[PDB]
């Protein structure tokens, strides 16, 4: 109605660019390094913890079967 | 001239800001702490 | 609190209360940013406290 | 109010309450320190055990 | 004073006195009256003086006993 | 730009160079009687190059001058509380005055 | 004497938060200080009973999980 | 002093040194309310509180283990 | 655990008092400065605020007789009292910080109460104390910063006091060796370095201030500019983790999203 | 009471002492508000930098280098500090 | 001296978006006149594509010393502490215990620490007094 927001010309170019980054993206050898890390390194990275330890962690009330405290003190002398 | 403001910073070492007045009783009532203690010393006898 | 979760209810609200108080003068840039820094680093601690509480339920079955 | 130029700061005369209130708190600290030190200085430094009397 | 370690409390006696777990040793007997003094005396420094120095004198003997039980252990290290 | 000796533009640059020359030394030396000496020493150093009309030596001395102020810069400069960078800066700034514009939302 | 020691500051905090506009400024600071003062007294009463007379308190309000 | 536009800004806390004209009238109106609430907390608190070390005597617990042994 | 809880209660009083008194120094001066390099010679002008700080500072320095002594010293006593390698290393770290506590405490008071004036002379003719409401809490905390540690010692640090709410395993009860096997030198060492170190620094600050202009020795200038920036951890956190962490979010936004 | 604000009467007095106390001002040089720091007072270009630095140090302010090059009469210094929030 | 924040590109080619090298607005002079005085930005100034990491709301950038200088000093600080710790551990210079560790009767309170049978005992017992 009364244009309560004092529109800034250079803000619009900023928002217009930030909403259209995908147009100017090019699949070079650097974008290929970041795609690999984020989609094939990390997902496979957690793809081994999620399977090397799946069904191998019986932690519910895991009792203690080992002494903790030393019984015989041997001085260095 | 050496230290051209000799007539402006003089009060930073005179009067209440002299070396004695600054350190004057920096320990609050040290002798008063002795003073009541001295009463208790001979009261202990 | 008599269980670890009630402690967590209080534990979080020190951060919410501090975030408001540290950034009390919200017109001062160094103070609005300082509230966010005090809120977020505590949440990093609270992120691990939640994880610890879970292992308490896993191993023992309760947080009392 | 006025500002007499080129005058040193005279020795202040704070309200009589503040000086007595300050010294009394300080006097207590020294009195308490001396009162305790007269009864526990060997024990503090280990010269005499508490049960030697 | 307390010139030697007093009679050791039996395990049935320690349970009934709610003695702390780490303070169950040769000096346990002297601790028992001291705790009763603290409760009515409000743990104050000036109230429980005789018993506290009586208790704390026992612990030094226990500490000295352990020293007397160290060179005994240490001699065996010099056996070979 | 082109350092023109005795020009007004160079007067300001020395005025700026000397303004930061005493402030930086003020921050390291917090006793007035010792601070007065340092100001005189620097003032006894802005007289050695006071009478120099050669631009070739002016750039090299001006390059050195900034390096000295940049080397001896105090990591924790003293700022007045209400000035920017202080402690009271933008504390309870009075609200901006502007008439309300009603809207039917 | 337990429920008073815990939730009294919460009552004082809310009074100035929402009723603060209606109770001025000076009359809003001292009410908040009043709410805390109640809790200070109630704590010492508990401290007397808990540390010295070995009494413990517990007020279970309602279940949560 | 200055103008802070408190004419339309009406938060729950007033803002900018706000004190209503009838602040004395509402002041006791809250003390009456607040004092009643604390009395409620003392009535609720004492009624429901309990000592967790006295609900079960020692003899009753000394037999629970013999049941679960 | 009993020692730490007791020292927690004590520290809540001789550290709350410091802030309030410091918050009164900043309020008393009409320029409302916070840098200690714009202070000096305030002892006569605001002697009540000085007295609260001085009593708090001595308690913070664990001077014998005060609340700090009954809580702070015994913790440091027991660093050597465990007689382990790790326990011994931390003892020196505590002992340095036990002395450092005595060194920067004197620095704060000297820079603000025993130094030649730095602020404009117009400030001093208006440098006074505050009202009674601002003064009442500081006096109440001042008393608790002297006597409270002595009265509450035996509740927590007493021998055999029943405190089963905090569990101490029987093999970990080393309180006996701490209070008996420490040589006399250790029981006074934090005080001897604290009192000697403070006075030595106090003379250097007063009569020999030419040494403490660190801009001469580049090694002492780099050292000063290192600890003054807080071990650069603020710079390492901002420029290398938050800045890096935000960049990961930018990479996902650009190369993935 | 606290500082009763800061009126130009008190402002001008504090500036005068700074000029009175500076021995680099040529002997004589009667100090009046309309007097210029160059002609009437005989302060060289580098002296004027020091005078303002003491002036900004006396009022606990920090005059920007861009604006401190424009203060050239004593009345300018009196007029400047008057309309300043951070003057104490 | 006044290095830009890390991870700031040098060349960006975003179609027809104007090319302007990044300027960190946090280091702008507060004393100059600005339309957006809090953010120190004049009206209608062009913005860098990654301007979110340069304006005031971005994390504060400390440019007092070189980052590799900071890592050098920060690592140097703990190198001395590691040196001090490592030297002691090598020769065992730290004091030895003056007495035997605290001992207890009843096989070191084995039963009192939840040892059901004589088989467990050492699984729960503390140090055991051998002078019963
Ligand atoms: C550890 C793994 C790294 C985890 C980092 C999390 C990923 C990035 C998330 C941070 C996003 C940036 C942000 O939160 O906003 C910026 C904000 C600015 O704070 P700042 O400028 O420093 O305030 C100065 C006031 N004068 O910055 C902040 O306030 C964020 C506060 C820090 C958040 C947690 C930082 C990690 C803490 C663990 C560090 C471990 C080091 C030992
Ligand atoms: C508190 C009420 C006073 C306690 C009753 C009087 C008393 O028994 O002694 C006064 C007490 C001295 O205590 P204290 O010096 O530490 O040791 C006893 C010395 N025969 O005095 C005190 O402990 C000081 C009490 C603080 C005031
Ligand atoms: C923001 C806008 C405002 C709107 C939201 C305001 C906040 C909401 C506050 C109320 C929240 C709703 C929950 C109250 C409903 C009562 C819940 C309840 O049913 O209690 C169950 C309790 C035990 O269950 P049972 O034995 O099965 O008997 C019930 C059979 N009908 O049976 C009972 O004996 C009833 C017990 C009633 C207890 C009173 C309720 C106390 C609520 C306040 C305390 C909340 C918990 C503490 C959290 C404070 C922070 C730590
Ligand atoms: C607008 C908000 C809307 C909120 C809607 C929900 C309100 C509560 C739901 C109805 C509760 C009705 C009620 O109070 O029943 C009485 C109940 C008795 O239940 P009973 O089991 O016998 O008590 C023993 C429990 N240990 O008594 C109780 O259980 C009450 C126990 C609560 C004690 C803690 C209260 C937390 C503090 C709340 C402060 C804010 C509310 C102010 C209350 C005024 C009194 C201070
Ligand atoms: C989140 C889960 C783990 C993901 C790790 C991602 C690490 C990474 O991709 O680092 C890349 C980034 C620098 O990469 P880039 O911006 O392309 O360098 C151009 C220089 N002209 O480097 C960084 O941004 C630092 C990330 C460190 C991760 C630890
Ligand atoms: C948002 C992004 C979504 C990403 C989704 C990620 C899903 C998880 C991937 C787990 C992969 C995995 O477990 O890979 C490993 C598997 C198993 O074979 P192995 O490694 O020889 O097994 C080793 C067995 N030992 C160690 C006992 C000898 O290999 C595959 O055949 C991978 C096929 C999947 C990709 C096509
Ligand atoms: C255990 C959980 C307890 C929760 C209850 C807490 C009660 C306190 C509520 C008081 C609200 C108040 O005061 O908000 C209203 C006040 C009003 O402005 P003003 O600051 O008075 O100044 C007035 C001058 N203005 C107009 C320039 C600001 O603030 C504000 O608008 C500030 C915005 C942030 C408010 C954040 C509220 C968070 C509430 C709690 C989130 C979980
Ligand atoms: C970070 C750098 C800090 C200083 C360097 C430490 C080097 C060192 O020697 O530290 C070694 C220490 C001590 O462990 P220990 O020697 O096995 O203790 C002996 C085992 N007792 C105590 C049972 C007898 O352990 C650590 O690292 C602890 C973590 C350090 C902080 C993270
Ligand atoms: C603690 C840190 C230690 C280190 C601290 C940093 C100190 C820096 C080193 C000190 C000396 C260094 O050479 C700086 C320099 O040369 S700058 C003087 C430049 N001089 C000219 O280029 C000639 C023109 N000279 C004039 O025009 C008039 O002399 C004048 C400037 C007064 C105008 O004023 P007005 O019109 O009379």
Query: How many other C-beta atoms are found inside a 10 Å radius of the C-beta of residue F105?
Result: 4
Chains that touch J (3 or more CB pairs under 8 A): B, D, F, I, K
C-alpha triplet F82, F87, F88: angle, nearest 5°: 45
Q: Does residue G61 line the site of ligand 3, with CB under 6 A?
A: yes
K15 touches A at CB < 8 Å: yes
K37 lines ligand 8 (CB under 6 A): no
CB I155 within 8 A of CB I161: yes
Q: How many CB atoms lie within 10 A of CB J52?
A: 21
Ligand 4 — pocket residues by CB below 6 A? G 3, 7, 10, 60-61; H 37, 40-41, 44, 48
Q: Is E46 in the pocket of ligand 2 (CB under 6 A)?
A: yes
The torsion angles phi and psi of J73, rounded to 5 degrees, stand at: -125, 160
Three-state DSSP at K41 gives: strand
Chains D, I: CB pairs < 8 Å: 68
* CA quadruple E15, E16, E19, E23: dihedral sign: negative
Closest CA to K56 of A13, C33, F87: C33
Q: What are the tokens at I79?
A: 């660093």
Residues contacting I92, CB < 8 A, separation 6+? K84
A39 lines ligand 6 (CB under 6 A): yes
Taking CB atoms and an 8 Å limit, are J10 and D6 in contact across chains? no
Q: Nearest bound ligand to CA C6? A: 3
Smallest CA-to-CA distance from I141 within I252, I2, I31, I12 is with: I12
Q: How far is the C-alpha of K14 from the C-alpha of K23, rounded, in Å?
A: 18
Residue I153 makes CB contacts below 8 A (sequence gap 6+) with E45, I6, I70, I71
CA distance E56 to D49: 10
| Cα A36 to averaged position of ligand 6 atoms, centre (Å) | 15
Q: What are phi and psi of J36, to 5 degrees?
A: -90, 145
The 3-class SS string of chain I reads: CHHHHHHHHHHHHHCHHHHHHHHHHHHHCCCCCCCHHHCCCCCCCCHHHHHHHHHHHHHHCCCCCCHHHHHHHHHHHHHHHCCCHHHHHHHHHHHHHHHHHHHHHHHHHHHHHCCCCCCCHHHHCCCCCCCHHHHHHHHHHHHHCCCHHHHCHHHHHCCCCCCCCCCCCHHHCCHHHHHHCCCHHHHHHHHHHHHHHHHHHHHHHHHCHHHHCCCCCHHHHHHHHHHCCCCCHHHHHHHHHHHHHHHHHHHHHHHCC
In degrees and rounded to multiples of 5, residue I105 shows phi and psi of -65, -45
Tell whether ligand 5 has an atom less than 6 A from the beta carbon of residue A32. no
CA–CA dist J86, A20 (Å, integer): 47
Chains I/H: 3 or more C-beta pairs closer than 8 A?
A: no
CA K94–ligand 8 middle distance (angstroms): 14
Tokens representing residue C33 in the block: 């940013």
Contacts of F among chains (3+ CB pairs under 8 A): A, B, C, H, I, J, K
The residue of chain A nearest to residue I171, with distances taken between CA atoms, is A69
Chain B residue closest to D28 (CA)? Answer: B33
| Distance from Cα G4 to the centre of ligand 4, integer Å | 13
User: What single-letter DSSP state applies at residue G49?
Assistant: I
DSSP lists the bridge partners of residue H50 as: G58
Q: How far is CA A29 from the centre of its chain?
A: 23
Chain F residue numbers with beta carbons less than 8 Å from the beta carbon of C25 are 90-92
User: What number of other Cβ atoms are within 10 A of residue K127's Cβ?
Assistant: 20
**How many Cβ contacts (< 8 angstroms) between chains D and E?**
9
Smallest Cα distance from D32 to chain B, Å: 8
- By the 8 A CB rule, do D18 and I47 touch? yes
* Pure H helices in chain F: 8-28, 32-43, 55-71
Catalytic one among J44, J47, J65, J69? J44
Q: Determine whether A77 is exposed, middle or buried from the number of CB atoms within 10 Å of its CB (0-12, 13-18, 19+).
A: exposed
Place of tokens 């023109």: F4
Q: Does the beta carbon of A47 lie inside 6 Å of ligand 6?
A: yes
Q: Which ligand is nearest to the CA of G38?
A: 4
Measured in Å, residue C11 CA sits from the centre of ligand 3 at 21
| C-alpha span between F4 and F55 (Å, rounded) | 7
Quickly list DSSP for K69-128. HHHHHHHHHHHHHHHHHHHHHHHT-SPPPSSPPP-BHHHHHTGGGT--STTTGGGT---B
User: At what resolution in Å was this solved?
Assistant: 3.8
**Residue tagged 């028992």 (tokens):** E32
Measured over all CA atoms, what is the biggest interatomic distance in chain G, rounded to whole angstroms? 44
| Residue B17, H or E segment | none
Residue J67 DSSP label: H
Cα separation, I76 vs I62, whole angstroms: 11
> Which tokens in the block code for residue B1?
């001239």
Span from the CA of A18 to the centroid of ligand 5 (angstroms): 21
Solved how? cryo-EM
The phi and psi torsions of K41 (rounded to 5 degrees) equal -125, 125
Residue among K106, K96, K98 at smallest CA distance from K126:
K106
CB I145 within 8 A of CB I59: yes
Ligand closest to the CA atom of residue E45: 2
Residues in chain C whose beta carbon is closer than 8 A to a beta carbon of chain A?
55, 58-61
Tallying the residues shown for chain A, one arrives at 77
- Dist CA B28 CA I56 (whole Å): 13
Instruction: Report the separation in Å between the CA atom of H43 and the middle of ligand 4, taken as the mean of its atom positions.
Output: 12
Q: Which tokens hold the place of F37?
A: 């000496």
Among all ligands shown, which has an atom nearest to the Cα of C26? Answer: 7
Nearest one of F77, J13, J53, F39 to I121, comparing CA atoms = J13
G61 interface with C at CB cutoff 8 Å? no
* Closest alpha carbon within chain I to K9: I247
- Is residue J86 annotated as a catalytic residue, yes or no? no
Which DSSP symbol is given to E6? Answer: -
CB I125 within 8 Å of CB D12: no
DSSP class of G50: I
Please state whether at least 3 CB pairs lie below 8 Å between chains C and E: no
Q: CB distance from D39 to chain E under 8 Å? A: no
User: Any residues with CB less than 8 A from the CB of I158 and at least 6 apart, and which?
Assistant: E38, E43, E52
Mapped onto helix, strand or coil, the DSSP state of residue G40 is helix
| Closest listed residue to residue I17, CA positions, set I47, I46, I60 | I60
Does F96 reach chain C within 8 Å, measured CB to CB? Answer: no
Cα–Cα distance, G1 to F97 (Å, whole number): 51
Q: How far apart are CA D6 and CA D12, in angstroms?
A: 17
Pocket test for ligand 2, best of E41, E42, E46, E47 (most atoms within 8 A of CB): E46
* Sequence-distant (≥ 6) Cβ neighbours of residue B31 within 8 angstroms: none
Provide the 8-state DSSP code for J36. Answer: B
D19: left (phi over 0), alpha (psi -120 to 50) or beta: alpha
On whether any CB of chain F is under 8 Å from the CB of H10, the answer is no
State the Cα angle at K37 between K36 and K40, rounded to 5°. Answer: 80
d(CA D30, CA B27): 9
What lies within 8 Å, CB to CB, of E64 at 6+ separation is none
Q: Rounded to a whole number, what is the distance in Å from the CA of D50 to chain E's nearest CA?
A: 7
Give the helix/strand (H/E) hosting A70. Answer: none
């Amino acid at each position: 109605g009364p244009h309560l927001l004092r529109e800034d010309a250079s803000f619009q170019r900023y928002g217009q660019l930030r909403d259209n980054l995908a147009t100017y993206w090019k699949f070079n050898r650097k974008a290929a390094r970041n795609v690999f890390i984020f989609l094939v390194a990390v997902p496979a990275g957690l793809g081994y913890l999620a399977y090397n330890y799946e069904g191998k962690t019986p932690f519910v009330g895991k009792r203690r079967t080992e002494p903790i405290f030393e019984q015989d003190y041997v001085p260095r002398k | 001239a050496g230290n051209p403001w000799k007539r402006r910073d003089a009060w930073r070492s005179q009067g209440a800001f002299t070396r004695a007045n600054r350190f004057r009783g920096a320990l609050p009532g040290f002798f008063w702490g002795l003073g009541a203690f001295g009463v208790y010393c001979v009261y202990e006898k | 609190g008599d269980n670890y979760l009630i402690l967590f209810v209080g534990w979080e609200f020190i951060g919410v209360a501090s975030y408001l108080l540290i950034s009390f003068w919200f017109t001062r840039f160094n103070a609005v940013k300082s509230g966010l820094s005090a809120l977020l680093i505590n949440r990093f601690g609270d992120a691990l406290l939640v994880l610890g509480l879970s292992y308490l339920v896993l191993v023992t079955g309760s947080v009392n | 109010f006025k500002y007499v130029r080129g005058a040193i700061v005279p020795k202040p005369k704070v309200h009589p309450g503040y000086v007595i209130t300050s010294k009394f708190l300080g006097g207590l600290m020294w009195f308490w320190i001396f009162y305790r030190a007269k009864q526990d200085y060997p024990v503090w430094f280990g010269l005499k055990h508490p049960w030697e009397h | 004073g307390v010139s030697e370690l007093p009679e050791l409390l039996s395990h049935e006696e320690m349970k009934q006195n709610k003695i702390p777990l780490a303070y169950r040793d040769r000096c346990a007997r002297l601790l028992v009256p001291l705790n009763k003094c603290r409760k009515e005396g409000w743990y104050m420094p000036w109230n429980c003086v005789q018993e506290r120095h009586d208790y704390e004198q026992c612990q030094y003997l226990d500490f000295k006993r352990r020293v007397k039980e160290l060179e005994e252990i240490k001699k065996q290290r010099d056996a070979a | 730009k082109a350092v023109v000796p005795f020009s007004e533009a160079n007067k300001k640059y020395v005025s700026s160079l000397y303004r930061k020359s005493l402030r930086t030394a003020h921050d390291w030396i917090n006793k007035t009687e010792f601070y007065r000496v340092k100001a005189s020493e620097i003032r006894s150093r802005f007289d050695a190059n006071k009478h120099i009309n050669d631009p070739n030596e002016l750039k090299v001395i001006f390059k050195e001058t900034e390096a000295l102020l940049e080397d001896y810069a105090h990591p924790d400069p003293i700022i007045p509380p209400c000035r920017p960078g202080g402690s009271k800066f933008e504390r309870n700034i009075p609200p901006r005055v502007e008439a309300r514009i009603p809207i039917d939302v | 004497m337990i429920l008073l020691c815990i939730f009294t500051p919460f009552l004082g905090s809310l009074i100035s938060g929402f009723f603060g506009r209606y109770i001025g400024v000076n009359s809003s600071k001292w009410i908040v200080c009043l709410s805390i003062f109640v809790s200070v007294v109630s704590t010492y009463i508990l401290f007397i009973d808990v540390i010295f007379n070995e009494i413990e308190y517990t007020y279970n309000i309602m279940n949560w999980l | 002093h200055h103008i802070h536009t408190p004419s339309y800004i009406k938060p729950p806390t007033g803002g900018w040194n706000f004190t209503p004209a009838n602040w004395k009238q509402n002041t006791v109106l809250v003390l009456v309310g607040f004092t009643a609430c604390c009395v409620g907390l003392y009535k609720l608190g004492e009624a429901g509180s309990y000592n967790p070390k006295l609900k079960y005597k020692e003899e009753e617990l000394s037999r629970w283990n013999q049941s679960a042994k | 655990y009993n020692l730490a809880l007791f020292h927690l209660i004590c520290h809540s009083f001789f550290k709350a008092l410091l802030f309030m008194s410091a918050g009164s120094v900043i309020h008393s001066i009409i320029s409302e400065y916070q840098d200690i390099r714009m202070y000096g010679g305030f002892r006569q002008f605001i002697p009540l605020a000085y007295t609260c700080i001085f009593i708090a500072s001595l308690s913070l320095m664990a001077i014998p007789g005060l609340t700090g002594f009954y809580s702070k010293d015994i913790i440091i006593e027991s660093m050597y009292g465990e007689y382990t390698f790790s326990g011994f290393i931390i003892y020196w770290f505590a002992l340095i910080s036990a002395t450092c506590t005595s060194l920067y405490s004197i620095r704060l008071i000297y820079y603000t109460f025993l130094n030649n004036p730095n602020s404009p002379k117009y400030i001093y003719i208006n440098l006074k104390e505050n009202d009674i409401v601002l003064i009442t809490p500081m006096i109440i905390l001042t008393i608790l910063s002297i006597f409270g540690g002595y009265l509450l010692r035996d509740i927590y640090l007493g021998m055999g006091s029943p405190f089963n709410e905090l569990f101490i395993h029987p093999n970990n009860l080393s309180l006996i060796e701490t209070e008996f096997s420490l040589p006399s030198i250790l029981k006074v060492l934090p005080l001897i370095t604290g009192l000697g170190g403070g006075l030595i620094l106090l003379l250097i600050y007063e009569f020999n201030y030419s040494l403490f202009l660190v801009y001469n020795n580049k090694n002492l200038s780099k050292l000063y500019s290192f600890f003054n920036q807080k071990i650069m951890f603020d710079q390492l956190l901002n420029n290398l983790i938050l800045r890096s962490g935000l960049n990961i979010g930018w990479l996902l936004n650009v190369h993935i999203d | 009471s606290s500082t009763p604000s800061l009126t130009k009467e008190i402002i001008y007095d504090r500036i005068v002492e700074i000029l009175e106390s500076y021995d680099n001002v040529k002997q004589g040089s009667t100090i009046s508000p309309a007097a210029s720091f160059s002609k009437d007072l005989g302060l060289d270009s580098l002296d004027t930098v020091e005078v303002l630095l003491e002036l900004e140090n006396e009022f606990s302010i920090l005059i920007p280098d861009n604006e401190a090059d424009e203060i050239k009469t004593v009345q300018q210094a009196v007029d400047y500090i008057a309309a300043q929030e951070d003057s104490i | 001296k006044s290095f830009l924040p890390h991870f700031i590109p040098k060349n960006y080619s975003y179609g027809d978006y104007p090319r302007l090298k990044p300027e960190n607005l946090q280091k702008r002079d507060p004393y100059l006149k600005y339309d957006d005085q809090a953010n120190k930005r004049n009206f209608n100034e062009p913005l860098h594509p990654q301007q979110d990491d340069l304006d005031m709301w971005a994390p504060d950038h400390f440019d007092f010393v070189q980052d590799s200088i900071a890592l050098k000093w920060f690592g140097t600080f703990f190198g001395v502490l590691a040196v001090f710790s490592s030297v002691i551990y090598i020769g065992g210079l730290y004091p030895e215990k003056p007495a035997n560790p605290r001992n207890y009767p009843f096989s070191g309170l084995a039963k009192d620490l939840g040892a059901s049978s004589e088989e467990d005992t050492l699984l729960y017992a503390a140090k055991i007094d051998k002078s019963i």
